[PDB]
Amino acid sequence: LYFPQRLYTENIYVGQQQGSPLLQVISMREFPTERPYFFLCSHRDAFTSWFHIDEASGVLYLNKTLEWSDFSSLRSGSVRSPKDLTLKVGVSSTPPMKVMCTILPTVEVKLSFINDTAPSCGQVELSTLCFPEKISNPHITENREPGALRQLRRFTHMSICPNYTISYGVVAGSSVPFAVDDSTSELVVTAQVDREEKEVYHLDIVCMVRTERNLEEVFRSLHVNIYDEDDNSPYVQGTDTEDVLVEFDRSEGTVFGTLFVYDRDTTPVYPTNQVQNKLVGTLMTQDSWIKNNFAIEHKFREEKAIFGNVRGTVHEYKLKLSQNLSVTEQRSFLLGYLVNDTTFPGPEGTVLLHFNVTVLPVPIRFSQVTYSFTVSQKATTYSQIGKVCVENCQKFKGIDVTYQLEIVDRQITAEAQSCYWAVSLAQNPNDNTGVLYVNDTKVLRRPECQELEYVVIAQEQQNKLQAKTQLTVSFQ
Amino acid sequence: LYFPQRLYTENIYVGQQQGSPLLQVISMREFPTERPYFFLCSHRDAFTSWFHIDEASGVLYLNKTLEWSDFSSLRSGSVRSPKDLTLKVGVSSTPPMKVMCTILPTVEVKLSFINDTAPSCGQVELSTLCFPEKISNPHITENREPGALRQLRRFTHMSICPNYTISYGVVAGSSVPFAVDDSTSELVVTAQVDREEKEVYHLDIVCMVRTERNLEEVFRSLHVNIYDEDDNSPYVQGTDTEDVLVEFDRSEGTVFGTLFVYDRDTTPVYVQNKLVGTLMTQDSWIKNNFAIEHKFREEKAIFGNVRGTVHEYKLKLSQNLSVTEQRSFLLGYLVNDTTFPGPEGTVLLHFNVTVLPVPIRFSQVTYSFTVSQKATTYSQIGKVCVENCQKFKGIDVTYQLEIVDRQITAEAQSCYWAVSLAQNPNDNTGVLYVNDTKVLRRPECQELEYVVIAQEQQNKLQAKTQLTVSFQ
Ligand SMILES: *[C@@H]1O[C@H](CO[C@@H]2O[C@@H](C)[C@@H](O)[C@@H](O)[C@@H]2O)[C@@H](O[C@@H]2O[C@H](CO)[C@@H](O[C@@H]3O[C@H](CO[C@H]4O[C@H](CO)[C@@H](O)[C@H](O)[C@@H]4O)[C@@H](O)[C@H](O[C@H]4O[C@H](CO[C@H]5O[C@H](CO)[C@@H](O)[C@H](O)[C@@H]5O)[C@@H](O)[C@H](O)[C@@H]4O)[C@@H]3O)[C@H](O)[C@H]2NC(C)=O)[C@H](O)[C@H]1NC(C)=O
Ligand SMILES: *[C@@H]1O[C@H](CO[C@@H]2O[C@@H](C)[C@@H](O)[C@@H](O)[C@@H]2O)[C@@H](O[C@@H]2O[C@H](CO)[C@@H](O[C@@H]3O[C@H](CO)[C@@H](O)[C@H](O[C@H]4O[C@H](CO)[C@@H](O)[C@H](O)[C@@H]4O)[C@@H]3O)[C@H](O)[C@H]2NC(C)=O)[C@H](O)[C@H]1NC(C)=O
Ligand SMILES: *[C@@H]1O[C@H](CO[C@@H]2O[C@@H](C)[C@@H](O)[C@@H](O)[C@@H]2O)[C@@H](O[C@@H]2O[C@H](CO)[C@@H](O[C@@H]3O[C@H](CO[C@H]4O[C@H](CO)[C@@H](O)[C@H](O)[C@@H]4O)[C@@H](O)[C@H](O)[C@@H]3O)[C@H](O)[C@H]2NC(C)=O)[C@H](O)[C@H]1NC(C)=O
Ligand SMILES: *[C@@H]1O[C@H](CO[C@@H]2O[C@@H](C)[C@@H](O)[C@@H](O)[C@@H]2O)[C@@H](O[C@@H]2O[C@H](CO)[C@@H](O[C@@H]3O[C@H](CO)[C@@H](O)[C@H](O)[C@@H]3O)[C@H](O)[C@H]2NC(C)=O)[C@H](O)[C@H]1NC(C)=O
Ligand SMILES: *[C@@H]1O[C@H](CO[C@@H]2O[C@@H](C)[C@@H](O)[C@@H](O)[C@@H]2O)[C@@H](O[C@@H]2O[C@H](CO)[C@@H](O)[C@H](O)[C@H]2NC(C)=O)[C@H](O)[C@H]1NC(C)=O
Ligand SMILES: *[C@@H]1O[C@H](CO[C@@H]2O[C@@H](C)[C@@H](O)[C@@H](O)[C@@H]2O)[C@@H](O[C@@H]2O[C@H](CO)[C@@H](O)[C@H](O)[C@H]2NC(C)=O)[C@H](O)[C@H]1NC(C)=O
Ligand SMILES: *[C@@H]1O[C@H](CO)[C@@H](O[C@@H]2O[C@H](CO)[C@@H](O)[C@H](O)[C@H]2NC(C)=O)[C@H](O)[C@H]1NC(C)=O
Ligand SMILES: *[C@@H]1O[C@H](CO)[C@@H](O[C@@H]2O[C@H](CO)[C@@H](O)[C@H](O)[C@H]2NC(C)=O)[C@H](O)[C@H]1NC(C)=O
Ligand SMILES: *[C@@H]1O[C@H](CO)[C@@H](O[C@@H]2O[C@H](CO)[C@@H](O)[C@H](O)[C@H]2NC(C)=O)[C@H](O)[C@H]1NC(C)=O
Ligand SMILES: *[C@@H]1O[C@H](CO)[C@@H](O)[C@H](O)[C@H]1NC(C)=O
Ligand SMILES: *[C@@H]1O[C@H](CO)[C@@H](O)[C@H](O)[C@H]1NC(C)=O
Ligand SMILES: *[C@@H]1O[C@H](CO)[C@@H](O)[C@H](O)[C@H]1NC(C)=O
Ligand SMILES: [Ca+2]
Ligand SMILES: [Ca+2]
Ligand SMILES: [Ca+2]
Ligand SMILES: [Ca+2]
Ligand SMILES: [Ca+2]
Ligand SMILES: [Ca+2]
């Protein structure tokens, strides 16, 4: 059972008689043998015993003839007319119990108690007799059993105008799965519908009234919203496999591959707790190295243009690094990822995704070309002289290399050790590059201090791998 | 003219005699008829008058027979020994003049004056007869003259073993453009070289020593570096045109495409081989909204055996484009290799830009949420989102809830305290949450109806849809 309508409304008047019908609450069956049992739930309120709902038909009736004192005694806190009354109506597929009112779905019946006697039939405009002032739009879910949807007669007004005949119809320009049941005056849905074909049905209702004058007609435009269920399995467009190379970029959080999965069903905006149409993924590997270093990132968003202008869901799966992978690691594996549409009925609601991963090692090493820098200008403290970099260091990401200058010859006099102050080195972690700059220019005034031979030492941090190269600086 | 090596070193000994050769400074020609003129530059030092260099040959000679007194009087009182002597040698393309010592490049000659006589023949290994102690790895410039690179013979030790005859040769793993001149014992480079083909050569020098009953040989490993010149023009790999679509991401700083420009030459940051670009437009609108992002790196991997330069060009936004913008233009960008001789040092890049407006509208005509009566304060109810709002960048959209029924009593108004809305600028959504649970005890407060209004900041474009919240 579900309710195609969350709120009912009507006016009630002083002098309205015991036993007169007010409105009909509708429950739609989710299965053909399901039978509704209606009951009132507002037993917390005193006014609820002014009313009676028929357990089988769902028609709500006055249980008491309304009086002036009934109006004035409503403790709402607003002394003004009209006083709104809110009733709760419950429905169940078994015989009703008191506790269902606290625990089952209910409908709100909002009544406006007007502190006056009912209007005379000559005082009601045909449009009001025919159709509520503001018509709320019903909703049904796709793939459901046809059934009555809305009682079209205004019960209260046909008692004001008892000598009028009133019939309703669906005006069908195109063929629509909606009609009126002439015998009950209900709008009914005549077939199962498909949210993926149409999410909103526009309807024009015609009311035909035989007056003392002629047969009159009034038209009312409304529409029915179609709710979605998970009735489409996810699928890939093109490949289910993404080739991933891990080499010079090994930094955590970087994305190395992206696979897209599509689902024609809708999903609440990401991220959500709803379980309808949720896709849950699972790494298809028992392997500690893979699990502790790699991870899949899942996101989804609504799209419609790619689905033929029908709202569905686009999923993105991205292979991510958990932590900076050591430059010595080298592995090639085919990583499966099972994507399961959990609420898709039957065992065809999954897609297997594949990440074909190549992880190459990254050597730590200078080219065999040693550096020689010539400073043809008079040295100025802090002027950059040159840069040092291991092979392909400028492509590195997630690899920390630190550079150091050291003196080539060891058995060197104390005085000769000072010529090497002329140049120093700074880390440019922007690239993992080394920047040579001038330091002490005072030592350059010595002709022996104008040709410097250094060793540059690079050190990868995670594994402590070292590379060396030679470096000469000529102050000219 | 250029020096293949910037520092020479040798030993000199007590008892070494006037006129004995010590070593040979090398200058490498950059034109076929260019010739070097060598000269000593050392001014104030007393030991400079001890030496002489042949202006034509570059051979440094002793101009004085070294006595014990010469050593102890050199910087008297210093306890160092040996005592290092630094000489400066200059070269010129025309007849040397005094002023040239101040304004033309020089190499340093560092002589170690040993306070002893030379070793006897029986004391030295053959390698000290053949080679200098310090290994020096020379350099040569690509696209220059072949010629003598290094004197291999060790002049100071010639007489240490008078009956030994000494000659030299080169061996490598591959064929190499290097050889020994039999007549001068010079290592020669026999061809012009191309840095782009080979950046360093690894040679083994062989010294053949003919003793009184044997032909012996000792080896020395050497490396010759090739200095890079800007002799390659930049080029594009594949297409010189990038199609760029500006839609949902329109924030300042966003990069839209990558054009790759390659240059085989190296690029020292500290003007050689520098590529400078120019925006090919006068359009005020374009310039005020777009710039070209240029980054570059040096790389051996993409070029193979020899380091080259990779440049990346990307069209970047200078500010958030209004969602109402819509225009298509073709934007040229000229990249110039400013030190490449001739007019072929430039490449024209193109950006083919389509900028599309972004509509501000709901694609869902109704949001319906169902929440527990026992729901706790601040628990998330759901999210709303204008069409494609999760792709938005540089677009400011806010969301607001409005009550539908305006003719509402004060008591019914308090029902709408149960729900509030928070902005989620991260993904451009609004977040509904539970606010006041106390009003949920009232049956009239359990079905709420709102209008959701989204408003784009710049243009005040609005979108509106229905939202219902049901407390069950
Ligand atoms: C809901 O609707 C109620 C009924 O609607 C009215 O009657 C319908 C039949 C119809 O014609 C409709 O159009 C009418 O609006 C309405 O109740 C009405 O209230 C008024 C105002 O009080 C009242 O008129 C006064 O009646 C006094 C006493 O009358 C006696 O008889 C009536 C009914 O027969 C009873 O309700 C009364 O309780 C009495 O039994 C008269 O004395 C009065 O005349 C003079 O004095 C009053 C001063 O009274 C005011 O102060 C007292 C004390 O504080 C209050 O208790 C009282 O309510 C007044 O506010 C002065 O106002 C006069 O101008 C005059 O100076 C006057 O005639 C109607 O009789 C009464 N009708 C009915 C049927 O009871 C109610 O107000 C509506 N409520 C809302 C929220 O909309
Ligand atoms: C969120 O909920 C709070 C109330 O819940 C309390 O705060 C939560 C954050 C949470 O901690 C709960 O656990 C906690 O109980 C709402 O706050 C109330 O807001 C209303 C309206 O602003 C206030 O009522 C007004 O009070 C005014 C004087 O203070 C008075 O002038 C007003 O009357 C005027 O306006 C009304 C219509 O607005 C009109 O009908 C009148 O005739 C007159 O013109 C009105 O009485 C309450 O005092 C506030 N309560 C508290 C405790 O601060 C908050 O609004 C809500 N946020 C939402 C829904 O966005
Ligand atoms: C430069 O070097 C000389 C050293 O000359 C020699 O050659 C070098 C390579 C080394 O092998 C030295 O050991 C040699 O001496 C220095 O002059 C010498 O210094 C030493 C140490 O101070 C002196 O040794 C002294 O010798 C005294 C006696 O020596 C004389 O008399 C003996 C008689 O047996 C005779 O055999 C000898 O030849 C000397 O004529 C000895 O009593 C004393 O204890 C001390 O050991 C040596 O005498 C010095 N000169 C000579 C000619 O021997 C210089 O000082 C050094 N210069 C600098 C600036 O450091
Ligand atoms: C500059 O770019 C436009 C637009 O290109 C479109 O948007 C970009 C962001 C890129 O992603 C492009 O891939 C994309 O198409 C170019 O005009 C466009 O040309 C294409 C053809 O290449 C048109 O597509 C269709 O092609 C089929 C052929 O199968 C035809 O039958 C269709 O009639 C249609 O031509 C596309 O419609 C067209 N777009 C517009 C707005 O005209 C443009 O050529 C390019 N200029 C360059 C590269 O110099
Ligand atoms: C998984 O990938 C390997 C290697 O793929 C290479 O590296 C990727 C990062 C990507 O750039 C691919 O295009 C590369 O080819 C595949 O093995 C290679 O397959 C190609 C096919 O033409 C072949 O030319 C190579 O020789 C192969 N290399 C090796 C080392 O075998 C492999 O087939 C992929 N596996 C699956 C199941 O897709
Ligand atoms: C850098 O040089 C200093 C000496 O020069 C000072 O620093 C320069 C960068 C510049 O600011 C000058 O004007 C300064 O006078 C070296 O400092 C010496 O370090 C050694 C050993 O660490 C120590 O024995 C000396 O006493 C220090 N002398 C002074 C004056 O500080 C420093 O080592 C150099 N750092 C390098 C080369 O990395
Ligand atoms: C996909 O998810 C569904 C949802 O739970 C799984 O369906 C259950 O599978 C278990 C066995 O693993 C059965 O005992 C249940 O009866 C199944 N239905 C349920 C729980 O509603 C399904 O197995 C998953 N498919 C996979 C992992 O391939
Ligand atoms: C993984 O690599 C990144 C980038 O190379 C490292 O990031 C730096 O980490 C140090 C560690 O103290 C910080 O001081 C720096 O501020 C970080 N800089 C940047 C740009 O990220 C990171 O530390 C490495 N390891 C981990 C576990 O993050
Ligand atoms: C590419 O860059 C070169 C080098 O800057 C430009 O050549 C110079 O242009 C100026 C401007 O007229 C002249 O005065 C110089 O004589 C030119 N040569 C040098 C060495 O500066 C050249 O114009 C640029 N090419 C383009 C197409 O803009
Ligand atoms: C109608 O009201 C009377 C009270 O006068 C009560 O006894 C009876 O049970 C009520 N009927 C219904 C259906 O609520
Ligand atoms: C309806 O018609 C009957 C019979 O003609 C008449 O008795 C009754 O009063 C009429 N009712 C109205 C509201 O006109
Ligand atoms: C070299 O050989 C000759 C014999 O031909 C011999 O007389 C001489 O002493 C040897 N040594 C030197 C240093 O000449
Ligand atoms: Ca469907
Ligand atoms: Ca569906
Ligand atoms: Ca689905
Ligand atoms: Ca070249
Ligand atoms: Ca070059
Ligand atoms: Ca170049």
Author numbering:
A (entry chain A): 23 to 498
B (entry chain B): 23 to 292, 297 to 498
Please, what does the article write about this entry?
RET receptor tyrosine kinase plays vital developmental and neuroprotective roles in metazoans. GDNF family ligands (GFLs) when bound to cognate GFRα co-receptors recognize and activate RET stimulating its cytoplasmic kinase function. The bipartite GFL-GFR complexes are recognized by the RET receptor tyrosine kinase (RTK) forming ternary RET-GFL-GFR complexes (Cacalano et al., 1998; Durbec et al., 1996; Jing et al., 1996; Treanor et al., 1996). RET has four consecutive cadherin-like domains (CLD(1-4)) and a membrane-proximal cysteine-rich domain (CRD) in its extracellular domain (RETECD) (Anders et al., 2001).
Crystals were obtained for a zebrafish RET construct spanning residues 22–504 (zRET22-504) with glycosylation site mutations, N259Q, N308Q, N390Q, and N433Q (defined hereafter as zCLD(1-4)red.sug.). Diffraction data from these crystals led to a structure determination at 2.2 Å resolution. The crystals adopted the triclinic space group P1 and contained two molecules of CLD(1-4)red.sug. within the asymmetric unit. The final zCLD(1-4)red.sug. model contains residues 22–498 and includes 7 N-linked glycans well resolved in the electron density. The amino-terminal CLD1 is packed against CLD2 in a fold-over clamshell arrangement as anticipated from human RET, while CLD(2-4) forms a “C-shape”. The limited size of the CLD(2-3) interface is typical of a calcium-dependent cadherin domain pair, with three calcium ions (Ca-1/Ca-2/Ca-3) and their coordinating ligands dominating the interface. Differences in the CLD interface size indicate flexibility between CLD2 and CLD3 but rigidity between CLD3 and CLD4. Superimposing chain B onto chain A, aligned through CLD(1-2), reveals that the rigid CLD(3-4) module pivots about the CLD(2-3) calcium-binding site interface with a variation of 12.3°, which leads to a difference of 18.4 Å at the furthest point from the CLD(2-3) interface. Comparison of site 1 of zRET in both the crystal and cryo-EM structure reveals differences in the conformation of residues 288–298 from a CLD3 loop. In the absence of ligand, this loop packs against CLD3 core (loop “down” position) interacting with the β4 strand.
